[PDB]
Amino acid sequence: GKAQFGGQRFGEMEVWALEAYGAAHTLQEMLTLKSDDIEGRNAAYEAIIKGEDVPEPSVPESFRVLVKELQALALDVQTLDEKDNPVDIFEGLASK
Amino acid sequence: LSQFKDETNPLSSLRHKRRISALGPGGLTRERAGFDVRDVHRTHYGRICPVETPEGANIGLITSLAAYARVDELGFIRTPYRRVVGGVVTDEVVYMTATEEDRYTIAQANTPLEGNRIAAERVVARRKGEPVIVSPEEVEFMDVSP
Amino acid sequence: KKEVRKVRIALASPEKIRSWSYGEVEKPETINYRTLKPERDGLFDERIFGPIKDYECACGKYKRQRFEGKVCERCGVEVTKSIVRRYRMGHIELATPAAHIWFVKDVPSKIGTLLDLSATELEQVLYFSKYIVLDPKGAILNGVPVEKRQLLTDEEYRELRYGKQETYPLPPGVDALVKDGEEVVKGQELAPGVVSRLDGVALYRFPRRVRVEYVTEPKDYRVQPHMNVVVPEGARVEAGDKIVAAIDPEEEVIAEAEGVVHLHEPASILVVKARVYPFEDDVEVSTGDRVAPGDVLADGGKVKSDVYGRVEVDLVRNVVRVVESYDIDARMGAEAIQQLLKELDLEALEKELLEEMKHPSRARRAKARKRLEVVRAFLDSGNRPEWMILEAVPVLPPDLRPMVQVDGGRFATSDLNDLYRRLINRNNRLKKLLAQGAPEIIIRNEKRMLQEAVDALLDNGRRGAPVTNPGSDRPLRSLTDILSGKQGRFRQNLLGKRVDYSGRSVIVVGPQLKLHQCGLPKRMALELFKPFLLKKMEEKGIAPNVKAARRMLERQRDIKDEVWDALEEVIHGKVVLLNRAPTLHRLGIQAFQPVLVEGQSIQLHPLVCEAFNADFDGDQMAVHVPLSSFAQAEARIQMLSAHNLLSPASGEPLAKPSRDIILGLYYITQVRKEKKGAGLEFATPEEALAAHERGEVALNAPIKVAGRETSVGRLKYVFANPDEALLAVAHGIVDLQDVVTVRYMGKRLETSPGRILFARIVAEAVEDEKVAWELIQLDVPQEKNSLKDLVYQAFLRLGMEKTARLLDALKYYGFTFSTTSGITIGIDDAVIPEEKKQYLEEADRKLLQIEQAYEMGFLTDRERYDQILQLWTETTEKVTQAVFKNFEENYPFNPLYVMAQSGARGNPQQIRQLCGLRGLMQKPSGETFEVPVRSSFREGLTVLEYFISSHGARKGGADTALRTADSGYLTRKLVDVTHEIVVREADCGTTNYISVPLFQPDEVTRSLRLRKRADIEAGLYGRVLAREVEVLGVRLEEGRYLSMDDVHLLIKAAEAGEIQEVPVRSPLTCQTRYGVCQKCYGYDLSMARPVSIGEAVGIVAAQSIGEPGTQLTMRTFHTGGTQGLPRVIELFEARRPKAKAVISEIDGVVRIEETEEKLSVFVESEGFSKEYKLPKEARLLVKDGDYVEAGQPLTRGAIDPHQLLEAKGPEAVERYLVEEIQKVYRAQGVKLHDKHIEIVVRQMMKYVEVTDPGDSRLLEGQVLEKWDVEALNERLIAEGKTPVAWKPLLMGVTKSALSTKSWLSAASFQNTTHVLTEAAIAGKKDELIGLKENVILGRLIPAGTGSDFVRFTQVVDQKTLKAIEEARKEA
Amino acid sequence: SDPVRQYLHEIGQVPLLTLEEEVELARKVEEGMEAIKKLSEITGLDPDLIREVVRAKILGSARVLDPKTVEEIDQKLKSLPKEHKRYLHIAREGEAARQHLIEANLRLVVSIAKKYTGRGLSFLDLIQEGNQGLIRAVEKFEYKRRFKFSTYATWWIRQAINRAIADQARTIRIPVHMVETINKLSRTARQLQQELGREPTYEEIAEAMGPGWDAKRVEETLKIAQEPVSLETPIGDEKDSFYGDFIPDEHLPSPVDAA
DNA sequence: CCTGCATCCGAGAGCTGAGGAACCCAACCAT
DNA sequence: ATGGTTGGGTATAATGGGAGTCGTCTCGGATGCAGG
């Protein structure tokens, strides 16, 4: 909304258009550096005002919200690497 | 049904006060409404405007009262007609519901007149919404105005 | 940090759930009402979930960093980042187990399938309506022993567990007819109105009076209800002993002397079924003890039990009574279900089901297969079935269910907090009741309420009435409602987001812009490019630091004028993305170079408005800024508007002249025609010139001189070059439309100066006169189609850069010429032909005749109605023809006629409505009014005619409103079914192909007729030739991409009879896994060149199919005098039609046998014969004594695709589906290549069903992917095993999409609960192959620049490469 | 479904009591408690432990301290010569009577609790808290006074229901006394409005409450009594806008502040 | 015993923008 | 050491609820019942 100084919605169909163009890096920028990659958006702003190029993006916060909400339904969702070993996306902040 | 009044200009408020809604508490659902409720029924003639309606997903579910129409004590819309007796148009005006209106032959308001007498051999009329051509002797009522 | 390659979902054990949590939530308190701080052990506790502030405990002993991993002793709060409050979970320990509703209410139930219980039985046991038997312990019910897994009602369990007893009242003044302790048989009357019903002993209950003798004479004592009788019936008493004990000592009854005791007038009598054993000393067993036969009760073993029962010791009568009852262990609820699930052995069940698979019945085989599916999923995943029952409930971290304080000082909170509070309250109350020894009814009720509370927390409103907050009707939002739906997490926050660096504004036409430019408002651009601007102001001297620049830009009146030049410096060479919703295809987002403008509107180029579907009556567009160098490169190379000139759907130009451009070009290229001369004959040109000078012959009249046709202008004005002709035009000598003679390119052309000017415009735009002369059509007026052909040819011959230059030149000159041409609309421009009047009068006569034929009986109602309708239809067609003929002959330059002929605006139907008449109108029921609207819009309708047309107007509006939603749904389904298809390799090496036919059978079944040119173009253009072709002395080699000239050559050869079909590579036969190959796909239609490897062709196919449907397939419907979108949806969903035709199952010859009552068709071949009985009213496409192949239709109507697959085969059904889908789009004038439909159909034909497992671990009737069964068969053949036998399937787009291997895409699509339940049971792992999964994880999609084919490319200059080479040589 | 009718059916599946049966059961319970304390004195163990083991043996194997220790103590109770197994017998009979009395009087709980609907607790929660109060009343009843059981039990059932309502009706817990203060304030304001013909002011409410009450205290008390609103409250006619979509996050630093 | 055919239940139904009811007494931990 | 908060008790007799919802159209599977 304009009254909340908000942004525009990049909905499903806009994502489809970006995919049809083959613009992979543009779409990943819309999904992470400009919406909810907190570390990514902070680093991108700092790099732009410092004169450098924006860094690589990370996991969006919405995927972490999804994982936590799936755990609340007693479902174990795990991200694995190429050897089927677990990879921690929470930076060790959620393991005892 | 209690809505923030639209008052961009005087006509906006006058339009808002004459709105008729099929939705609301105890009404139809926009996503569930089909095609039968949104149609212009033949009995809308003189009671609900066939033109003025929203363009989007509310088309046919919100309408407007016609200019000469009146809602009675029982909640039924009535429209006025002049009584025609023996091919002579009188000034007696009767407000009818659609049920009463279905019983008569009603001539168009542009029927030519010489004084107050139907001066035309062939008269365009409605019989239960059907357009018919009749003689002036068969006319029972006449429209008040377009 | 290792990269994420897979995502696994599985069931969580109670141990896993408890290891997740940081503590148990024990209280339903959220925050302290006074200090607003989290309460201890509540739902927001910092001791469990984490600190509110960064590196600071609650009490404040520690308030700094490097205390990480330090838990404060005083408060117990770990000192760390507060962000951990959105990651750390809690848990609730249930007093009694509860079931996860997802594995109960997801039809068919997983728990029910594993335990072989129906839905009704599961509901009865789980919600405490029936018991289930575990360890029957040899109990007997109705004479039948009870067995395990048997369901007992309340009464049945009560009689088996506690016994039988009935108490009968005795009215005052009526005494019993039996003594105390006497046995009773059913029917033995105990009162003049009381008859017993059950056998067993009868005991007294509160005898009202007592008779005691005195050693004898009798005496009576009345006993009031507040006192009790201690002495037993029929026993002696002594002097001083008390008989009837009372509360008050003075109210006690003490016999004065010796005597016997008898009890009379009982209050009630209790008949039980029990054994009686009298004793004389201490007993062994007390009340409430259950015993077996031959057990010790009293007297040191002298008395022994004969039956099972429960012991009750009566001290008044000094007797032990064994009530006949058993110790059956029957339970209710999730505890019973979990006990049954824990005992289940999966391997023995698997063996039993494998044996069951051999039963001859197919229903039993299906039941066993369905059970084995679940059993094998559990065996493979490693999950335990008992984990479907919850013991510890996880608690979501508090920052995902926030309790926030709004700006007004109030609080807002999620519904999950209320659901958790209800669960905790009910759990705590159950624990309190259990520790207090409550009766069984109260505990049953509390356990039922706890089960319902867990159900509401997990899935609200799935069973029973949904939970609502008090005073309000709105249901609470549970975790399932958070996850699924259009408003759910998947569709609202993962597949689409709101973004930074974006704006939006109203759009305005930009006629002075270039094709690659947009006008961007200055304030918009200052806000969009703010960090770049701050850095640029830093680089200059506008601000000393970035913070000062930000403060300057904060206030509008503080902004200087050098910042605008800095902003111009910032955006130099960059592009922005413009997007207009809805984004139906990929050209709804385009990249433009911004030009900073004054004002608040975005300026848009005229030529992109058709791609965007934008006009200028208030539309708005969104602006996005790609940030990095990669994003800017992608936007500038792939998305720039000037690089996207052809349509990806059809290969036709999409940026092309329209509206005023067409109007101006048509106006200047149309020649004049005059009638003053009118074909006079002359001998010598001097005579023709003399006659023109006299005024007898007009300049452009078609005269004949010396026996040849010419005009005066052709002889009078001969020009040496185009410059002289245009100089003559500038002097008023001739007009642009007069036909003269010009010498051009060494040839004496007879043409108008306007056409020469158009040729010069093209030649100067493309900077090449010879190629420009080859491109244009000189001798026709330039209209929509010729200009589109010119643009396509220019693209093919010159490239996108020169084509864009030509487009801008054409736009400029068309606008200029339409401004000065004099195009306008007046009321007199809607010319009414005179013939119309005649056509009406004639109609008025014929109508009369019809009425006569109806009055005299020769016509019925229906036939007369049909005759009237046909008459008015033919009259309307005649009036349309007369209107257009009048325009053609008398007013060739009329504005309406020019607009409709040039293609700028309008169609013949609208012009007829303006000039001739509106025609027949339809009633709301869908039938036509008898009387038509005989007026046009120029004359003016009457009130009745207007009201008649309103029905059609409203029907069209409502049709548009419904068709939009239906088409959007179809597009989403297609995207979900095709999103993983990418061009992944150059060539799959297959030798299969498809044959495109150049002929089709006739409608009247006459013979083979050549197909339309458009159809063949849509089926052949851009494809790779599968085999060598030789036509018209030209050899087209194998592997050749078919260009449009080759397609025209093939059509020309077909017209000469040399060829009947073309073999081409197609996606239907490609062997690439997870996509297609370059050769099997063909051209990139938007570039007229072979497709690049890494292109996401599935998304393009889905958008190409879905975009036309949104409006075109049955835009504003004009109410003037099975099919459409539903047919396409039916074809894509593989539905069986309601009017399904009849197709011959096998080959044979046809014999039609029709009787007075029945009709049948026999197909008789040399081996067998079949009979088809169809209703007599049906229509046959077959004649008697005809030959029909297998799958050949015998009836008019739609063919069942599954029947066709069973009869003819998979290629037949694929061809049928492609052709039938293309029919609908051709009906609406939509051009769309067959590649896209073939992509979708190839996805639809992806699965096979196992008919014979062979030597594999598959089951009969199991459905799997064709690639998997092919690989398994190849391995078996290599190893020497029996092959798996299978049959192809056909499923719709919805079912095919939901059956994908990736659970993330299927979960985000539809039916989320079912997908997640199945994936969790099976322990499914997602390999992230498609696009939706990678988008959800925020990863680089494996298409385009993210493809593995291109994304590892390096770039380096010569010097660096030489240096590296020398470094290698040195070592 | 409809668990209310299910519970009502289970409740009505137990017959009511007459005065004789009720007084008999109450006397049996009292003698059972006396026998329990006598047995505790004889064996020297705690009354609570012996009551728990006797209740475990009465309720049987169906109701799931462990079988080892309960069987040990139950055998130790069987070791008594005479006149003490009698006390054990009366203890068991009294516990059975307690169970029967509670089951028979469960209907009065529903009759009482049906008048407290619409105050933030559902009907079945009210019924369960009333059942807890009923169990308390059975524990504390005395039949010597010749009072009907309902007379004494109604007070305890009402106490349990009201304490439950004051403890579990609000998302933010408020202490019991201040809940009573809020209810008193609401009643006072309502009567003031009824007498005044318009909504009272804070000064008038303060005057009506009495000493130690002024406008500021009334304002604070009305301030704390506000209930939280839902982040999922719909906004607008369409089901596409919620309340929480308009509430920004103020905790996490913005990109500007981080830079 | 098999089979098909009414019957019932649950999950779908375009995008974007804007929009707002008792009281009392007594003891016990917190600060 | 003071309010703030929590627990226990009140004794004639009382003993099975209440708001509600009826203007969607389809489709695919699960299921029980009819026939042979």
Ligand SMILES: Nc1nc2c(ncn2[C@@H]2O[C@H](COP(=O)(O)OP(=O)(O)OP(=O)(O)O)[C@@H](O)[C@H]2O)c(=O)[nH]1
């Ligand atoms: N994406 C999208 N565009 C729309 C929609 N409705 C209208 N538009 C676009 O906005 C343009 C102007 O809309 P109008 O119908 O003139 O007016 P409006 O802004 O929608 O507002 P009102 O008529 O005042 O209700 C249209 O010509 C369309 O391009 C819609 O529902 N979605």
Ligand SMILES: Nc1ccn([C@@H]2O[C@H](COP(=O)(O)CP(=O)(O)OP(=O)(O)O)[C@@H](O)[C@H]2O)c(=O)n1
């Ligand atoms: N609900 C809606 C309403 C509109 N739209 C979009 O806005 C446009 C408005 O056309 P329009 O209705 O302005 C065209 P009209 O003036 O009749 O056309 P003509 O000049 O070509 O004859 C549609 O074509 C859709 O792209 C939408 O996506 N959802």
Ligand SMILES: [Mg+2]
């Ligand atoms: Mg609008």
Ligand SMILES: [Mg+2]
């Ligand atoms: Mg338009």
Ligand SMILES: [Mg+2]
């Ligand atoms: Mg528009």
Ligand SMILES: [Mg+2]
């Ligand atoms: Mg000359």
Ligand SMILES: [Zn+2]
């Ligand atoms: Zn601390």
Ligand SMILES: [Zn+2]
């Ligand atoms: Zn291939």
